[PDB]
Amino acid sequence: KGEELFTGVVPILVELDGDVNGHKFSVSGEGEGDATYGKLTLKFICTTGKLPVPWPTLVTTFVQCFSRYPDHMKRHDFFKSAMPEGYVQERTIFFKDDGNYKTRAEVKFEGDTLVNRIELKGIDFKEDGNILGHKLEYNYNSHNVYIMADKQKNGIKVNFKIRHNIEDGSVQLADHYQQNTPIGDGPVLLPDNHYLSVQAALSKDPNEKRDHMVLLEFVTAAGIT
């Protein structure tokens, strides 16, 4: 079991290659993951200067193998069973009445480090919309992430909507269609339906001058008796 791999606080590296409406950018992240607790701490920096999109819009794109699966759930944990060979995470994110993000990532162990490498392509945003106009609050809400087994592809099928709060007191929904599929030949662990409970909290390093985002994530699995 790759569950034996998350026994401690694992180190995390995130590399995202990006392009939204042709605006290229790149972000690097680093931090650590305690799956036992159910907790991530990550910090990100735009290395091409300014991020052309609000930071909150990439939180879900920037490692669900650090979800805390209670003891009677531990076998619905595809995310870890797929390790250290890892898996591929593919998504489409439709921002309601605005553009979309299309992401492919590989999440696998690269030594002791758990690494998430992301290709993101984003099209059809409105330059004076909520996303390209930077009208989102620098903050994040609490969501459930709903997980189904997809034996067909022998991976999973995940869905949820993010509720991005808008300056004007409004909500911008972002609808996530997600699938994860195993990299290795050595069998993933297909789950009964459950959900992950995700609270994310967003901050700034007062000493960091580059465009960055600090992230604290708390996740714990749930739904099964």
Curated annotation (Swiss-Prot):
Outcome after substituting Q64H: In P4; leads to no detectable fluorescence. In mut2.2; shifts fluorescence lifetime from 3.03 to 1.94 ns. In mut3.3; shifts fluorescence lifetime from 3.03 to 1.88 ns
A Gene Ontology BP annotation from the UniProt entry: bioluminescence
Keywords from the named record: Chromophore, Luminescence, Photoprotein
Outcome (variant: V219R): In Azurite; shifts the excitation and emission spectra to shorter wavelengths and increases quantum yields compared to BFP
Cysteine pairs bridged by disulfides in the record: none
Pfam families: GFP
Effect annotated for changing A201K: Abolishes the tendency to dimerize and leads to monomeric fluorescent proteins
Industrial and biotechnological uses noted in the record: Green fluorescent protein has been engineered to produce a vast number of variously colored mutants, fusion proteins, and biosensors. Further generation of mutants led to more stable proteins (at 37 degrees Celsius for example) with brighter fluorescence and longer fluorescence lifetimes.
Recorded consequence of changing M148T: Increases fluorescence at warmer temperatures such as 37 degrees Celsius
Modification comment: Contains a chromophore consisting of modified amino acid residues. Maturation of the chromophore requires nothing other than molecular oxygen.
Outcome after substituting V171A: In mut2.1; shifts fluorescence lifetime from 3.03 to 2.50 ns
Impact noted for substituting I166L: In R10-3; matures to the red-emitting state with excitation and emission maxima at 555 and 585 nm, respectively
UniProt tissue specificity: Photocytes.
Top-rank taxon, per record: Eukaryota
Effect of V145I: In Azurite; shifts the excitation and emission spectra to shorter wavelengths and increases quantum yields compared to BFP
Outcome after substituting N144K: Increases fluorescence at warmer temperatures such as 37 degrees Celsius. In Esmerald; leads to brighter fluorescence. In VisGreen; leads to brighter fluorescence
Residues forming coiled coils: none
SUPFAM superfamilies documented for this protein: GFP-like
Effect seen on changing V63N: In R10-3; matures to the red-emitting state with excitation and emission maxima at 555 and 585 nm, respectively
Family: Belongs to the GFP family.
Function: Energy-transfer acceptor. Its role is to transduce the blue chemiluminescence of the protein aequorin into green fluorescent light by energy transfer. Fluoresces in vivo upon receiving energy from the Ca(2+)-activated photoprotein aequorin.
Description of how the protein assembles with itself and partners: Monomer.
Protein name, as recorded: Green fluorescent protein
Organism: Aequorea victoria (Water jellyfish)
